[PDB]
């Protein structure tokens, strides 16, 4: 199905994936750790950044075609911070399905993609009933 | 089952939601359209920002107390930025499907969320064959 | 039959809509509400603006050329104003009717389109016998 | 039924069509012509102004049922604006019958008129599927 | 039994409901939020601000029963401010209902909107015995 | 049931109430009557304004401390302002009336005493069929 990818850089810090079949196809993720002190208690915070950066051709227009004509590629980019505490992951794993559920709404299913905020939108918290 | 929110903050580019029942737990989506000259075509870039933010009081030792003592609150943040060209949203959004997928299976599958970033992690591409 | 568009720009005095497929097709309507006192009576105008913009490529020679690379493009634009009082909208919607008529016996029937005026045309008016 | 105008003013530009029974209701018609180049080509542009107007008395106090009351009129105004080179006149006669129905759909069937939109509406392109 | 009215300007901040069949009565919230400290603990506070206007034409003759006759409108307001914190929404709620009572003996009841005062009035407390 | 106050202070055109238990808990009620001019008639205007206004303690947490010490307490405030022609005060009372059901619908049953709006809510008027 999906193409597996490879490892191209490894570090303590940062690893990035790409595509043999195709290298301009990349995914990284990158972590930052902070010594955090809150009140009287002590937290490892953690920022977590995944970058997914794909290449893509813009559509076919008019005016000169054949079979053979490329069109110049664009940037496709989503790029995902989590920021917080590590000795409160649980919580935080919530609230990223969570997350996931809102931009779905939003763009998934909606015209935020085209560039359309709708205030009516179903936005739910993390925290049930 | 999720508590809904309801806007708080309304204007053509920015939304802000917030839970009647706790404030201070927010998720705010911000979106640009510019008008990118690809190299020999016109396109149209939608930006869009999604930010979740919820303040999570810290964790109190094993068998602390009853309420009468309050922790400070933590700072669980997710960001997102979808960055693409209007015209192949529907590429857009299996690359965002795929973006789900790799970040879960390091952050919520594995332990990239307490700083243990995994170079074996099965990642996958976008395209599919 | 007729592919719809979706809005991009919602508020409580202007809406534009825009072709999902083809953008840079728009239609924006905006309305400005004011107060007019006319006699001892006061009356609530409204003035409704409503544009219609189609970016449309020169005409094309019969056979003169295939589809790939985008000549220049022209505007084509439509442009309504509405104004009444909204006591008074009935008779509005009327002599709206009738200027679609006259103006479809000048350009959609007769010359005007190619810019040729016509004193013989048959104009009617909104009152009716 | 209605009761046809005749051409008050004759000009190379202007006509004004106006109701002998009523010199209160005119419709008049202004084309500008202009040579314009789109590169590859030099084409003829016209701007057709058409107006309606009309004086009509602010309405009766209800069931007051007598022609011994009477009110100052107030205007009825309507100007629409067709832009386009005299050689797309074949899709730009389309593209007004999209308008057309557009206002038809905000205006006459809606509430637009009344001072307030809805952006729930069903706008449709002048290119069809 | 009531007109319903609709939201002909929204806003984050402010909304304002008007009849379409009668533009000239509007009911309009306004809300402004700010952040408060008590010393021990910091405070949400949220200030409501609603009004109520009707234009009202003044009293006919007495026994004129006629439509004929017409008289310029006066001016009905009716302004109410909200003030508290969020914390106590549920005491506020209370306190509303006393302010209604408390108005209610004094204006709806006795002679206040003529202009009599009572100091006789039965005013009650937001606290129950 | 609910326990009355007592006046503190009466004037010709303003009287204070004040709770005897718990004072700082009061009821103040204000008049301006004004003779203003509408049309050829001249029609008196009275200006009513009430104000409630409760010293609140903030919020408790449950089973925190027991029941010396006042902490900082905050201020709890309603404001109400009737204004409208003595000659007409039936149709005055009746508005008030659907202010009350306004504000409830806003205030008492939806969110908006935390800070939400609602453009869905059943906004009626005074006008009845």
Not at 100 to 114: E, P
Request: proline residues 6%; contains cysteine; charged residues 20%.
């Amino acid at each position: 199905a999906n193409k597996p990818m490879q490892p191209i850089t490894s570090t303590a810090n940062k690893i990035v994936w790409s595509d043999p079949t195709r290298l301009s196809t990349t995914f990284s993720a990158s972590l930052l750790r902070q010594r955090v002190k809150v009140g009287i208690a002590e937290l490892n915070n953690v920022s977590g950044q995944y970058v997914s950066v794909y290449k893509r051709p813009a559509p076919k227009p008019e005016g000169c075609a054949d079979a053979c004509v490329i069109m110049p590629n664009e940037n496709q980019s989503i790029r995902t911070v989590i920021s917080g505490s590590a000795e409160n992951l649980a919580t935080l794993k919530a609230e990223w399905e969570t997350h996931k559920r809102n931009v779905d709404t939003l763009f998934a299913s909606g015209n935020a993609g085209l560039g359309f905020l709708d205030p009516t939108a179903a936005i739910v918290s993390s925290d049930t009933t």
